Amino acid sequence: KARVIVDKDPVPTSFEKWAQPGHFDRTLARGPKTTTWIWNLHALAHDFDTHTSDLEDISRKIFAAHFGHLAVVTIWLSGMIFHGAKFSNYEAWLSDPLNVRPSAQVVWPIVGQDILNGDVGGGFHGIQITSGLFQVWRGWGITNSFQLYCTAIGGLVLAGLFLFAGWFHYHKRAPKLEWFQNVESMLNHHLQVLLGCGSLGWAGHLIHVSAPINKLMDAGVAVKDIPLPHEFILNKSLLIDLFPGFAAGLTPFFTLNWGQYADFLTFKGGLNPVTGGLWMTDIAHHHLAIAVVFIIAGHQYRTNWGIGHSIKEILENHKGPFTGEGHKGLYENLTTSWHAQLATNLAFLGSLTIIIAHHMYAMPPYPYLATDYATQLCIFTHHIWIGGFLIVGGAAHAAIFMVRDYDPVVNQNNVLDRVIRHRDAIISHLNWVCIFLGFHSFGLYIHNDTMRALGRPQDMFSDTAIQLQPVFAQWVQNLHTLAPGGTAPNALEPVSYAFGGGVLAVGGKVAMMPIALGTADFLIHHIHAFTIHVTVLILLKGVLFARSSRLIPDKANLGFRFPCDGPGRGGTCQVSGWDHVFLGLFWMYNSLSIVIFHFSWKMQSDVWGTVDAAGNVSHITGGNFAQSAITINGWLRDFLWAQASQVINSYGSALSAYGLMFLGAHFVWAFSLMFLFSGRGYWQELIESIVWAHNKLKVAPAIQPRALSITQGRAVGVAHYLLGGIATTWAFFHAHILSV
Amino acid sequence: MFLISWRGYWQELIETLVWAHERTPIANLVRWKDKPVALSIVQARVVGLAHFTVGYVLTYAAFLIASTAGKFG
Amino acid sequence: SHTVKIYDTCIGCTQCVRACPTDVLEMVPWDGCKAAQVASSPRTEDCVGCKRCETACPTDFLSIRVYLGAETTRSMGLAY
Amino acid sequence: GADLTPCAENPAFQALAKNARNTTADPQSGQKRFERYSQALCGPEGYPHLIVDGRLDRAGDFLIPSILFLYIAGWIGWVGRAYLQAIKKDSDTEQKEIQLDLGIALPIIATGFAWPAAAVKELLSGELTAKDSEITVSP
Amino acid sequence: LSGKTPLFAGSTGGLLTKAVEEEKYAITWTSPKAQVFELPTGGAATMHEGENLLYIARKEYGIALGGQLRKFKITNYKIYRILPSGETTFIHPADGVFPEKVNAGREKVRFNARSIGENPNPSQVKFSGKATYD
Amino acid sequence: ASFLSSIFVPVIGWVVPIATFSFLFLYIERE
Amino acid sequence: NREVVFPAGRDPQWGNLETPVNASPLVKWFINNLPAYRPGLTPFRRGLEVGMAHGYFLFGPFAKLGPLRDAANANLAGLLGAIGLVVLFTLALSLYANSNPPTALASVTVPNPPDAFQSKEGWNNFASAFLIGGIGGAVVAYFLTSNLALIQGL
Amino acid sequence: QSSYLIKFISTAPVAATIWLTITAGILIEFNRFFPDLLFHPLP
Ligand code: CLA
Ligand code: CLA
Ligand code: CLA
Ligand code: CLA
Ligand code: CLA
Ligand code: CLA
Ligand SMILES: CC1=C(/C=C/C(C)=C/C=C/C(C)=C/C=C/C=C(C)/C=C/C=C(C)/C=C/C2=C(C)CCCC2(C)C)C(C)(C)CCC1
Ligand SMILES: CC1=C(C/C=C(\C)CCC[C@H](C)CCC[C@H](C)CCCC(C)C)C(=O)c2ccccc2C1=O
Ligand SMILES: CC1=C(C/C=C(\C)CCC[C@H](C)CCC[C@H](C)CCCC(C)C)C(=O)c2ccccc2C1=O
Ligand code: SF4
Ligand code: SF4
């Protein structure tokens, strides 16, 4: 029964509540007797569930809060392209994308910081960029600055509309709870319009604008000689010369004579030799196929015409012998709790973001991205990290659903109740797996690290010694190299040259080549499996044991965020679902940090490097990965100690900021250790003595000062531990790759 | 680990291992005499700092001696 | 095992007994003219030592303390 | 003076002065920098060295900066001390700490230029120190 | 000791080897209705209309359950301690009156007539075998 | 007398741990 | 179809759950008729069969992967190295036996009381048989692998 | 009302941001005209 239900003018728009803080909560609204009130104000600002219990009030805040968030992203995205318009070398970069490095940031001639605007290239003095926005605009067919200047103003205009929306909705026209609960209507709309039509539209831009323009640009024509996009639409003579399939018109589409469009809807599946990047026609045929699949898929659900599926009926009818009632009650949990929806969306979105990073490096989808190793490395590293954070957030809100929104009446002998009733077996076996892998993933390094020191290189786990080869992956590789012909016959070249095939060379660089898998990759892939399993153990344990444990029978009453539940029973320290998330983040950081290290050294040693006319590929680090990555000292020597030479020696040059942020990052990491190792008890007694000196000199504060709370001290530490950690490798990855 | 990670996480973890060992077929024959429990709060502080110190002492001695011995000043 | 000692600053709020997970504390009649109720700790053997009694006491400093001592199966919270 | 020479005549200083790397937008910022630094004392490396002895021959190094700081810093403490005391007489003290009463604060910020006089006045006879017997203490 | 078991499929979280060897516990309660209640160690279970009985590994599981029972307006919950030899002892409402409410028959235990500041120093009491909290 | 190293080293690595941990494990577990 | 997972026995209060892996027809026979649970055997015969299985198992890793695997005395190192490991395994039993070991547990797959491992005598007799059978299994595996070329050469 | 807006500006963050930006801009702007200032040159 889809319907638009709205409440008119629930909440006014006065500036009164701005002045008095803590309006959202009653405890904070009383007054700030203590400095912990300040920290609690921020920690409870987005805890709408604590402010009120009416789901209408919660959902209205959430739906409007999203709009204010989009304005921030649009202002950001519009801000990036604006810098490309005014302060940049993009117009000059198109003339020579292989000799001019991309820059869009300029720092003013104030104290000593004009050095950062070095000779990046093209007569422009600016900071070199690694986000890859230059390659995106070329994929968008943007060839002049005024074109970019127009798009930036459009984003700022779009920002006000989103901003106007959240005001209009929370204050003037607030939807009721029924408007959000019609799930079946929501999913049809997003799949078909937001994803389907949005994909179908982008196919139009690629076919009409990007593919023709880029087909002229790689040919060798000057940038000024390229016609504008509207010129292609009006004058069809120019379009037919490149893609003669358009001469037939739209009649082959309706008559199902779709082969006439083969020129610009190809299935080559390889990279463009001229510009390192996938073919625009292949990308053009991409979104058209995606849109039809999405448009069709979204009609599955009923949305108030009797035709379609009810998700409740799908889930309930998937019972089985082993699972008692199957998926019964999950629809009720997901329709009565925002945290459950947030946990599912975060977890799979994070895994998606990691899945993007692996596709992009092997299948570079933009022109000249592969030759820019700096953009390629930071791009992979970026999304790899963002996906790791979002996955951990999924476990947190998964546990928050348990303490706050779990209904035992609904979850009775269902798939979830049955999972909690054997949680001991889930963790005890996952405990066994984590120990098994940590021994047989890291112990093999120690055996190699120990043997090479003893002068016994024959007894190692190396390619000449006992080698454990990854036969399973090498088998899967050959199937992809042979997909040209046989299975997937119409494809001319494989989906990626990473699986195998011939080498591709752009200028003097190499875009991609076969990534051979040896003993080193067999070990590192297990190291990843080891580190991934442990954070799952930490996070999954918090979800199941948040309600109760053998130690604590009533853990839900204390809440999701409680420090200890006392010092007895031995010690109940960090027993909450919150503290599991706190611990899992360190392991998320540990696991994710080896992935990018596996990426950096392998791609530099095996893949990237200058290429000669005869095909001789002079790799960057000289193929040292196979015989050095098997030992821990090899990474310390060949990866960290050696490649960090550019960072420390960056002083007196344009990359000096990276050497500073690199060194400064170690500080914040160590500053984290104040809060993790210490405890609130010592610090409150220190403040006591300091308060005496103020009471002496009559500088005593009315707001009585107290040390930080326990969970805050843990939160403050992990924030520093990760910020100081990530910023370190951030500068090392940047300064090293930018020099080479 | 002993500094950052504190007891209450580990005791619950050990309780699962107690379940499996008591409910596994063949290792059910053998059983602890003293009940296994997580290290106390003060103990983990003791174990953690010795680890902090022993690592601190050793890895600098290696650097102090090897750097000086290799060059011999 | 863990000794629970009560002092004269009690005022009969009874908030300590309601917080006890294991029912160690029990209110008893104060024969004097202070109130009709003052706390006690008869079943001290089941004191796990979670200090919930102390957090619930409204005095300046505690009317009831929990001095830790020897451990047992009942105190360590072991279900095995 | 210890292991150093005058900065004007040191060769290593003149060697760096030719390549000064002007900081600001002004082209001659580099040459103007090394010109003023000729007054100071320099070492073998070519960089200048400051002497905080307290001798009046070299007082711009630390002594003049020292006086300029303490006048500025005492302004901040005297202002904060007076604003905090004035609030305590009012009823709602905690809210005024967060939501500042600018009507009370800006008159105090207008003062503070004469903080040394008020400091001596409170020290000689006044409220610069509270008694030890009337302050909270541990056992 | 009599009653009916709450109807649930079972759970790993529950009774272990300690029950056979030493001091398993039990809890009894009676409800007019038959609702769904969360168990002390994971899971959910229904409850019969008369004389429900559940075996628990510790005393903390029962009072934690009893607090949940009070949400359903059930105030008659009795906890036992069953030894390996079958000896049962009625514990939690040791008298008919609950602990939070006062009863005349009870006596004060481990009460110090002094305040905490008045306790002696440790140096005043060393090698005597007595503690400061006495 | 370099052969003594071949006899005294493994005694420290194998015989001494086995004998000490054997007695201690029984001593700590005694009643 | 209906449920496959049930509570241990009639009581759902107890921890263990009846599952296919725990309470299938096939698994119950194998585990209960293994020497550690087989009915009608003395403690000595149980340890002999167990050790004989383990000495034959432990010879392999030392020989084909230990040091001197690529040498003439490779198979000999496996026999001596395995016996040294069996002796430590034998010593461990004597300590667990001579420390008043509490009891042996009964699970769903082995519902009855498992065996007479409820005393020091049962474990001590188990230990004496482990060394006898344990050394025997390794000696067997040595002569086969060393003379496997001859046995095929026949 | 304007009285409510003034209270918002007088709060801790906005008062701190307005003040620190002013003190920052002074040092920032003074340093572009008077570049280096390692010490006070003494006549
Ligand atoms: C500190 C004392 C100590 C000493 C003296 C040794 C000595 C030895 N270790 Mg060892 N080890 C020690 C501590 C010590 N370990 C510790 C603390 C660890 C833990 C990390 C290890 C881990 C370790 C591993 C992982 C390995 C060794 C191996 C070896 C042997 C290698 C000899 C060789 O050149 O190849 C072999 C040369 C040969 C001629 C074959 C060796 C035949 C064995 C040693 C005969 C032993 C007979 C045995 C004791 C019989 C007892 C029966 C009796 C009780 C009835 C050697 C006997 C290696 C090995 O395979 O030994 C078998 C091996 O793989 N050790
Ligand atoms: C259908 C299956 C089958 C198979 C595969 C065999 C195979 C064999 N039989 Mg046989 N047999 C069978 C059924 C079978 N039999 C039946 C049904 C009968 C009843 C009529 C017989 C009666 C019979 C007699 C009477 C004799 C054989 C012999 C033999 C062997 C002679 C090989 C040769 O040329 O000279 C010899 C070649 C060699 C390479 C030497 C062989 C050494 C033996 C086979 C090694 C066995 C080790 C053994 C696995 C240890 C068991 C312990 C283990 C279970 C743990 C050969 C292994 C002859 C023999 O003496 O074998 C020793 C012999 O005299 N068989
Ligand atoms: C047009 C002006 C206007 C006015 C006068 C109000 C007034 C009000 N709104 Mg409202 N609102 C507006 C616009 C406005 N809103 C818009 C445009 C949106 C859509 C985003 C909303 C969405 C909204 C929600 C969802 C809620 C309110 C609420 C409120 C009330 C309390 C707000 C408060 O005291 O916190 C004042 C808080 C601030 C001034 C801080 C806001 C920070 C902004 C939004 C984000 C800044 C991001 C920034 C880039 C991060 C940088 C970080 C780094 C650099 C340090 C109050 C009546 C709340 C309410 O009624 O409570 C029951 C409530 O729940 N409003
Ligand atoms: C879609 C993303 C998303 C959303 C909508 C939420 C939303 C929420 N989370 Mg959540 N979370 C997420 C992702 C998300 N989270 C991820 C990825 C993690 C893993 C790190 C977590 C971990 C997490 C925990 C552990 C907790 C929450 C909690 C909450 C709730 C209250 C938070 C609050 O008061 O905000 C205000 C939050 C703050 C003021 C903290 C500020 C943290 C700053 C931004 C860190 C600095 C990072 C910055 C980039 C550093 C550089 C700049 C700096 C140097 C200037 C709220 C419902 C809390 C709760 O009670 O839920 C019921 C809670 O306990 N979340
Ligand atoms: C380098 C430091 C370090 C190491 C080695 C570990 C090790 C471990 N942590 Mg961990 N941890 C650390 C830092 C570390 N942690 C920090 C800083 C934190 C705070 C965030 C945590 C937080 C944390 C949590 C929250 C969890 C772990 C878990 C684990 C275990 C995973 C199982 C495994 O890998 O098998 C064991 C593997 C090893 C011990 C690796 C080295 C072993 C070598 C190869 C063998 C030694 C050779 C030989 C036998 C020596 C004999 C010598 C003889 C003389 C005695 C393992 C014990 C998880 C766990 O226990 O789940 C099972 C878990 O839940 N840790
Ligand atoms: C934890 C990982 C690991 C692994 C896999 C190995 C592996 C190895 N090490 Mg080594 N080592 C390690 C860590 C590891 N090491 C560490 C951390 C150190 C530093 C102390 C060393 C130091 C070291 C030295 C100094 C030496 C070795 C040597 C060896 C080799 C001989 C092994 C041997 O004789 O053991 C024998 C092993 C056994 C008797 C037990 C095997 C257990 C089996 C495999 C269990 C299987 C379970 C089964 C699948 C499940 C049953 C299911 C059931 C239901 C049916 C072998 C390649 C030796 C060598 O020369 O290398 C070539 C040697 O001298 N190691
Ligand atoms: C399929 C299957 C399976 C598998 C199995 C296996 C893998 C087996 C094992 C195997 C083994 C583990 C074997 C072993 C055996 C051994 C033996 C065969 C022994 C021998 C012995 C002997 C013969 C000795 C004798 C002696 C003595 C005692 C003394 C003196 C000397 C002599 C030498 C005379 C399972 C069950 C898992 C599961 C289910 C299914
Ligand atoms: C240091 C530390 C503290 C003490 C840390 C404190 C009190 C942080 C204080 C942060 C700032 C400095 C508070 C004051 C901020 C001022 C009001 C800002 C002045 C205004 C100008 C800056 C404009 C804990 O409370 C703690 C608790 C638990 C585990 C570890 C620790 C821990 O390590
Ligand atoms: C891992 C871990 C555990 C579990 C650790 C356990 C149970 C210890 C297991 C180690 C075993 C006993 C092997 C250790 C062997 C040592 C190498 C030698 C110790 C013997 C000396 C007496 C010589 C805690 O109990 C804990 C408690 C509080 C904060 C952090 C932690 C913590 O991090
Ligand atoms: S320490 Fe815990 S169990 Fe003991 S009386 Fe206090 S609250 Fe109750
Ligand atoms: S003062 Fe403390 S112990 Fe005494 S009655 Fe009140 S809460 Fe209970």
The residues pairing with E46 across neighbouring beta strands, listed in sequence order, are E7, E36
Q: Of all atoms in ligand 3, which is nearest to the CA of residue A19?
A: 34
Q: What is the CA radius of gyration of chain H?
A: 17
Amino acid at A2: A
Residue numbers in G near E21 (CB within 8 A):
103
Inter-chain contact A466–G65, Cβ cutoff 8 Å? yes
Residue-level length of chain C: 80
Which helix or strand (DSSP H or E) is residue A633 part of?
A: helix A632-634
Q: Around A9, how many Cα atoms within 13 Å sit in the side-chain half-sphere?
A: 3
The first and second tokens of residue A107, run together, are 């720092």
Considering only CA atoms, which of A421, A317, A319, A415 is closest in space to residue G2? A319
Distant-in-sequence contacts of A448-455, Cβ < 8 A, 24+ apart: A448/A630, A448/A631, A449/A631, A449/A632, A449/A633, A452/A631, A452/A633
Q: What does the alpha-carbon distance between residue D93 and residue G19 come to, in Å, rounded to a whole number?
A: 67
Amino acid at E10: G
Q: What does the alpha-carbon distance between residue A450 and residue A453 come to, in Å, rounded to a whole number?
A: 5
C56 Cβ inside 6 Å of ligand 10: no
DSSP at A40: H
Amino acid at A234: L
Nearest-CA distance G107 → chain F (Å): 26
Q: What does the alpha-carbon distance between residue G112 and residue G115 come to, in Å, rounded to a whole number?
A: 9
Inter-chain contact C23–E16, Cβ cutoff 8 Å? no
Which regions of A507-596 does DSSP assign to beta strands (E)?
509-512
List of residues 6+ apart from H24 with CB closer than 8 A: none
Inter-chain contact B12–A431, Cβ cutoff 8 Å? no
Residue numbers in D near H10 (CB within 8 A):
99-102
The first and second tokens of residue A283, run together, are 């990308």
The first and second tokens of residue B69, run together, are 């011995």
- The CA–CA distances, whole Å, from A209 to A88, A205, A206, A277, G48 equal 23, 5, 5, 17, 82
Burial pattern A169-181, b for ≥16 Cβ within 10 A else e, equals: bbeeebbbeebbe
The first and second tokens of residue A7, run together, are 């409440």
Amino acid at A513: M
Sign of CA dihedral A134, A138, A144, A146: negative
3-state secondary structure string, E62-78?
HHHHHHHHHHCCCCCEE
Residue-level length of chain E: 134
Tell me, yes or no, if H38 comes closer than 8 A to chain A by beta carbon.
no
Cβ–Cβ under 8 Å, residues E99 and C18? no
Q: How many CB atoms lie within 10 A of CB G132?
A: 15
3-state secondary structure string, A569-592?
CCCCCCCCHHHHHHHHHHHHHHHH
Q: Can you tell me which residue has the tokens 């080698």?
A: A467
DSSP at A637: I
Q: What does the alpha-carbon distance between residue A497 and residue A353 come to, in Å, rounded to a whole number?
A: 22
List of residues 6+ apart from A256 with CB closer than 8 A: none
Calculate the dihedral angle through the C-alpha atoms of A553, A556, A557, A561, rounding to the nearest 10 degrees: 120
In the reported structure, the alpha carbon of residue A4 is separated from the centroid of ligand 3 by a whole-number distance in angstroms of 25
Considering only CA atoms, which of G16, G51, G45 is closest in space to residue G116? G45
Inter-chain contact C43–E115, Cβ cutoff 8 Å? no
Tell me, yes or no, if H21 comes closer than 8 A to chain A by beta carbon.
no
Q: What does the alpha-carbon distance between residue E27 and residue E54 come to, in Å, rounded to a whole number?
A: 5
D99: left (phi over 0), alpha (psi -120 to 50) or beta: beta
List the 54-113 stretch of E: residues with Cβ below 8 A of G: 54-55
Q: What does the alpha-carbon distance between residue A211 and residue A367 come to, in Å, rounded to a whole number?
A: 11
Query: H-type helices in chain G, by residue range?
Result: 20-23, 25-33, 43-65, 74-97, 120-146, 148-153
Interface residue of E16, E36, E38, E79 to substitute, partner A, most A CBs within 10 Å: E38
C21 Cβ inside 6 Å of ligand 10: yes
Amino acid at A203: A
Q: Whose CA is nearest to atom 3 of ligand 10?
A: C47
Tell me, yes or no, if E17 comes closer than 8 A to chain A by beta carbon.
no
Residue-level length of chain G: 154
Burial pattern B21-54, b for ≥16 Cβ within 10 A else e, equals: bbbebeebbbbeeeeebbbebeebbeebeeeeee
The first and second tokens of residue A267, run together, are 């299935």
Q: Whose CA is nearest to atom 5 of ligand 10?
A: C24
Tell me, yes or no, if B12 comes closer than 8 A to chain E by beta carbon.
no
Distant-in-sequence contacts of B39-43, Cβ < 8 A, 24+ apart: B39/B2, B39/B7, B39/B10, B40/A570, B40/A571, B40/B7, B41/A567, B41/A571, B41/A573, B41/B6, B41/B7
Which helix or strand (DSSP H or E) is residue A134 part of?
A: helix A133-139
Sign of CA dihedral A489, A493, A495, A499: positive
Q: What does the alpha-carbon distance between residue A717 and residue E67 come to, in Å, rounded to a whole number?
A: 36
Experimental determination approach used: cryo-EM
Most informative mutation of C57, C62, C65 for ligand 11 (most atoms within 8 A of CB)? C57
Q: How many CB atoms lie within 10 A of CB A457?
A: 13
Pairing of strands A103-105, A609-611: unpaired
With 0-12 / 13-18 / 19 or more C-beta atoms within 10 angstroms meaning exposed / middle / buried, residue D98 is: buried
Q: What does the alpha-carbon distance between residue A569 and residue C47 come to, in Å, rounded to a whole number?
A: 9
User: By 3-state DSSP, what share of chain F in percent is helix, strand and coil, each rounded to 5?
Assistant: 85, 0, 15
Q: Of all atoms in ligand 9, which is nearest to the CA of residue B41?
A: 28
Resolution in angstrom units: 3.2
Cβ–Cβ under 8 Å, residues G117 and G123? yes
Inter-chain contact C79–B35, Cβ cutoff 8 Å? no
Q: What does the alpha-carbon distance between residue A382 and residue A358 come to, in Å, rounded to a whole number?
A: 12
DSSP string, B7-42: HHHHHHHHHHHHHHHHHSTTTTS---SSPP-PPPHH
The residues pairing with G6 across neighbouring beta strands, listed in sequence order, are G18
The first and second tokens of residue G15, run together, are 């921890």
Q: Around G75, how many Cα atoms within 13 Å sit in the side-chain half-sphere?
A: 13
Which helix or strand (DSSP H or E) is residue A184 part of?
A: helix A183-189
- The CA–CA distances, whole Å, from D71 to A113, D64, D82, D114, H26 equal 31, 11, 16, 9, 18
- The CA–CA distances, whole Å, from B73 to A690, B59, B65 equal 48, 20, 11
Which helix or strand (DSSP H or E) is residue A125 part of?
A: strand A124-125
Q: For residue A567, report the phi and psi dihedrals to the nearest 5 degrees.
A: -95, -5
Tell me, yes or no, if G1 comes closer than 8 A to chain F by beta carbon.
no
Task: Give the closest ligand to the alpha carbon of residue G154.
Answer: 2
With 0-12 / 13-18 / 19 or more C-beta atoms within 10 angstroms meaning exposed / middle / buried, residue D91 is: exposed
If DSSP codes are grouped into helix, strand and coil, which group holds residue A318? coil
List of residues 6+ apart from A158 with CB closer than 8 A: A74, A78
